[PDB]
Design an enzyme around this catalytic site. Structure first.
Site, short mmCIF file in Angstrom:
data_model
loop_
_atom_site.label_atom_id
_atom_site.label_comp_id
_atom_site.label_asym_id
_atom_site.label_seq_id
_atom_site.Cartn_x
_atom_site.Cartn_y
_atom_site.Cartn_z
N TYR A 222 10.70 -8.33 0.09
CA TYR A 222 10.46 -8.87 1.42
C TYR A 222 10.71 -10.36 1.43
CZ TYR A 222 8.27 -4.41 2.52
OH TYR A 222 8.03 -3.07 2.73
N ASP B 130 -1.88 -0.15 2.76
CA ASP B 130 -1.64 -0.63 4.12
C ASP B 130 -2.13 0.40 5.14
OD1 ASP B 130 1.24 -2.48 5.48
OD2 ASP B 130 -0.93 -2.79 5.77
N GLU C 67 3.92 0.50 -5.78
CA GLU C 67 3.54 -0.90 -5.93
C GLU C 67 2.31 -1.08 -6.75
OE1 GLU C 67 5.78 -3.13 -2.27
OE2 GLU C 67 3.60 -2.88 -2.10
N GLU D 197 11.78 -0.41 -0.23
CA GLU D 197 11.22 -0.96 1.00
C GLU D 197 11.87 -2.26 1.38
OE1 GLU D 197 6.92 -1.24 1.04
OE2 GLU D 197 6.52 0.75 0.24
C1 CKX Z 1 4.55 -7.07 -0.01
C2 CKX Z 1 3.94 -5.69 0.08
C3 CKX Z 1 4.55 -4.91 1.24
C4 CKX Z 1 3.93 -3.53 1.45
N1 CKX Z 1 4.57 -2.60 0.51
C5 CKX Z 1 3.81 -1.34 0.50
C6 CKX Z 1 3.81 -0.70 1.87
O1 CKX Z 1 2.84 0.34 1.86
C7 CKX Z 1 3.32 -1.66 2.92
O2 CKX Z 1 3.44 -1.01 4.18
C8 CKX Z 1 4.16 -2.91 2.83
C9 CKX Z 1 3.78 -3.78 3.98
O3 CKX Z 1 3.13 -4.92 3.81
O4 CKX Z 1 4.05 -3.43 5.11
#
Ligand code: CKX
Ligand code: CKX
Lengths: 587, 600
Positions: free
Chosen positions: A455, A163, A400, A491
């Site tokens: 999420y 990201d 991830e 997260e």
């Molecule tokens: C569904 C994956 C979510 C993702 N998870 C890793 C973080 O590095 C990102 O910031 C986060 C995002 O989409 O904000």
């Protein structure tokens, strides 16, 4: 290797800010050996800072390739009888450096220091030319990975899979350092608790004595020899055991701060000194308004003031190693830290849009054996320099990763096992992505406590909290019974632009952030195994451009200039309502 | 479609019934039909404003996202000086489905959400007393609706509506409700068609259904001086030496058709503009002169009324489009309020008239989560669907046929033409539309991913309409690649079809206030740079005769990770404030000569 601290060991900080900077668009530097003469047609740059946003120029910002720093320095006069060695605390991605026409260093790794003795290329009293060549390219054998793409015209453009934005440059401290001519390298300490013991190992050029002094620094016990064990009888007490090197004719003294640190994992509990704990706090980022990822003391003091006010007692160095200053701070202030390396983007299932990426994740085309060994080097450097910090409470191998494809566990098994070989004192995790759920993930077996980035209600439950709660709870219970580990939600968050208010509690509004986070909190309250909550980002940060990101990732509790959204007062009420380290029970 | 004309005021009249405040109640478990709620005053009601969507009037998410039946209700005193007259009750738009009770007699039923429906209800009321109007409104979309959708029922039986268009599925009575009186001699329908040769003189053939008696006609002047007269239920040709309807002005004669019965007279004035549209090669002619469209794809969308028509909103939005230099627009994704086509008529605004056929595409939604696998199939876009579509074209053409501002019909917007059966579906619809009105061209707005080497159905239509977003959804943030891709794709379309090309959507999401030195996506600077590059490419392609930026104002959509409080592609904010790009366009659109393509 560990951080330079000064006593009869000295240094001249070379974060002199303004160096000569130049881009190398047509790759002439190495061949014309630019380090040989003063940079042609340069501009001033700041050296604790990313080069991307300092010039308000889109063509420096999105630049891919080689860039050049240069700076002349006078070596202090009282060093003529010393070893002069040159340390960069972080060159993001790749750096190679020449001390006056002679090449001295090279390093592939964006968040770890690298140093080298240049005493035979310097003499105290005069001025030397320092030239640095910094590369910001990612391939499949880099940490993190990526794919450079060269178009029809020969223009490079970098593609990656994480990201945050691919900021680069000299992000942290440059340092000239001198130490007496016998002691060079490392020291390691390990601590135990009995419901009070230690160990030592020094590597230097001669006899070693060590004495543990306390915060009043009166000696509380002393030994001397590379090993053995002493015993003793919100924020944390840090003793100081002062290790001395008696040898040749010159003595050398190094001070290393130690904290009574203890913990492994026990059933479903993350204990600390045999105490259950609840992590509260944040996934962070090194990202600010004009410095990119450049460290800055003001920012550190302010954002610690914010986490302190909000009640967080912990955080996680999301997606790369942080400025060591922050772990020293966490040391003195008793902040619990999950240390993570730069191994993000091992996943090709996350990119979403309307746009040829490799077809088989684990294979020679992508993550190969070279990738696994560069990875092991990254884990090696992170542990090698953050091993003695009490604040580091857990290592995290990667973030991830895609574990559905074939070959995933063949890749990650030697890394988990090797890291347990690298330090058995702290637990091992690998943060898990949404779509490798409880019925699917391959690698969760190999780690001490599993960390989930979920999420529901945002990416997969279309803004419907009432179903998202149910999904998230099943999946919770499922995970625990499948592994009976502690669960730390590393997260959880939603994009919300400060200022968007809505009576309908719609996605992107501040009301939706509040409602969503507190529903997540309600399920946390009701499941035994969750021992931690760290919301997805403390502040908004920059990402590469795309139809999913409005000027960056807006998932922060604070705006990029550190102003609080409404949820900042939601969390502050919950995280300071519980008592410290204890989870709110179900109502 | 069924005969219908706009109720206009002659020596026989109408009484407005958008008194706004009606009784409203939702019908959460379909008890309405069973207890035939139409029989007694609505149980547990709250005041609603008519016209206006019901979704956002109460600031409550549970009404907003509601799927099912809702109930509006209102008593009315019928004026007595109407005895011995035919009383008709017309709803100008009840969005999606509506059926209505004059206390206990049901009179009408309708599935089109943006076209009027009336019924002669003279035998169910008698002047002087007050009768209760009860309306049942449904907001559900299946595969045989225009537009289509899929209602899905969760474990608990609660409905949630899924659809495949961008804008939010507002519902309710969006436009005028109205009782109107006419003499017992019916002027049920009129059709007017115009011809011209070299601007000097010609004629307007004519046809009329007047159910009850003799008809004479007089075409009168802006001075209402008689300039010609006809006699007969059809033919009704006359020749002129006229001042003909032109984009900058909009000169409107008045066709006064009279219907003499043996005792009763009936007078209808229908405004006509003498214009001739056609296409020749790569040029879109109006009165035999090439034309350049400038302007917008719009929406019926405002901050608290949803899609409810509003006069202030019409006046102010025309003030902005006029200032900004727009000369044209297209009724994006459904038929608009006829008030707007009357306005365009009087002011000379050129309009591309579109039906509600959006979402005939399952390739556009993007995310992480069951849509049918065959677009054209029995389970999805089926034969019933095709007749529903042909019906939608029938009503829209039936209602906007005589408007001079309407310059082109558009059957649908961004359908997927890749799967086989796309041409099987759209071909008979194109042919049928061509027989329902041969006066104006036929278009079908083309989606970004059915490119020139891929699209299947563009052969069947007169003018090519492109929705292109190079630099936004693909080549994201890169102006130098988007320019090349766009220019070769435009030239490709031209080589393939040698039609006039109108870029009917092109735009980028722009947060008002978000500024950037790096000209990156979502900033106002990016909107300006992007539109500006697109403009250089238009200026360098021969066949492009039109530009309508995607959206005049920001509008509301379904919730999703791609829509930040809605689609932010507007030049103006939802409350009509201008972004920086608004002054870019104003500089272009009033810099060029009117109706002429910039010469590069
Ligand atoms: C569904 C994956 C979510 C993702 N998870 C890793 C973080 O590095 C990102 O910031 C986060 C995002 O989409 O904000
Ligand atoms: C590539 C499809 C673009 C799409 N075109 C249809 C409009 O109704 C939408 O508003 C627009 C958008 O997504 O902004």
């Amino acid at each position: 290797m560990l951080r330079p601290v000064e006593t009869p060991t000295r240094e001249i900080k070379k974060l002199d800010g303004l160096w000569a900077f130049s881009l190398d668009r047509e790759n002439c530097g190495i061949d014309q050996r630019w380090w040989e003469s003063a940079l042609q047609e340069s501009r001033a740059i700041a050296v604790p800072g990313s080069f991307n946003d300092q010039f308000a120029d889109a063509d420096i910002r999105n630049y891919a390739g080689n860039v050049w720093y240069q700076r002349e320095v006078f070596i202090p006069k009282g060093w003529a009888g010393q070893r002069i060695v040159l340390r960069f605390d972080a060159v993001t991605h790749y750096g190679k450096v020449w001390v006056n026409n002679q090449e001295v260093m090279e390093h592939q790794g964006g968040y770890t220091p690298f140093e080298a003795d240049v005493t035979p290329y310097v003499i105290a009293g005069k001025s030397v030319r320092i030239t640095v060549c910094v590369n910001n390219e990612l391939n499949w054998q880099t940490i993190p990975p990526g794919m450079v793409i060269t178009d029809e015209n020969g223009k490079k453009k970098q593609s990656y899979f994480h990201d945050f934005f691919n900021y680069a440059g000299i992000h942290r401290s440059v340092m000239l350092y001198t130490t007496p001519n016998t002691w060079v390298d490392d020291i390691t300490v390990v601590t135990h608790v009995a419901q009070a013991s230690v160990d030592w190992q020094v590597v230097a050029n001669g006899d070693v004595s060590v004495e543990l002094r306390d915060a009043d620094q009166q000696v509380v016990a002393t030994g001397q020899g590379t090993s053995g064990t002493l015993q003793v009888v919100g924020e944390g007490y840090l003793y100081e055991l002062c290790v001395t090197a008696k040898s040749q004719t010159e003595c050398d003294i190094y001070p290393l701060r130690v904290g009574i640190r203890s913990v492994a994992v026990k059933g479903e509990q993350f204990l600390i000194n045999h105490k259950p704990f609840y992590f509260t706090g944040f996934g962070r980022h090194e990202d600010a308004d004009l410095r990119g990822k450049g460290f800055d003391n003001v920012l550190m003091v302010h954002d610690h003031a914010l986490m302190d006010w909000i009640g967080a007692n912990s955080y996680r160095t999301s997606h790369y190693p942080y400025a060591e200053e922050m772990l020293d701070w966490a040391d003195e202030h008793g902040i619990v830290v999950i240390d993570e390396t730069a191994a993000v983007g091992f996943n090709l299932s996350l990119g979403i849009g309307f746009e040829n990426k490799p077809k088989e994740l684990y294979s020679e085309e992508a993550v190969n054996g070279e990738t696994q060994q560069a990875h092991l080097q990254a884990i090696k450097e992170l542990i090698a320099r953050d091993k003695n910090h009490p604040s580091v409470v857990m290592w995290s191998i990667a973030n991830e990763p895609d574990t559905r494809p074939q070959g995933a566990r063949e890749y990650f098994a030697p890394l988990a096992e090797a890291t347990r070989k690298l330090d058995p004192t702290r637990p091992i995790t690998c943060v898990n992505v949404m779509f490798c759920d409880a019925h699917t993930d391959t690698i969760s077996d190999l780690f001490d406590v599993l960390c989930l980035n979920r999420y529901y209600g945002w990416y997969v439950q279309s803004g419907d909290l009432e179903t998202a709660e149910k999904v998230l709870e099943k999946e919770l219970l499922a995970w625990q019974e499948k592994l009976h580990q502690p669960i730390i939600i590393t997260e959880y968050g939603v994009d919300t632009l400060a200022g968007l208010h809505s009576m309908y509690t719609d996605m992107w509004s501040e009301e939706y952030q509040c409602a969503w986070l507190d529903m997540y909190h309600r399920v946390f309250d009701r499941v035994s195994a969750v021992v931690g909550e760290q919301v997805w980002n403390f502040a908004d940060f920059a990402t590469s451009q795309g139809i999913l990101r409005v000027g960056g990732n807006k998932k922060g509790i604070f705006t990029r200039d550190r102003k609080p959204k409404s949820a900042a007062f939601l969390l502050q009420k919950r995280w300071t309502g519980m008592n410290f380290g204890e989870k709110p029970q179900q109502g």
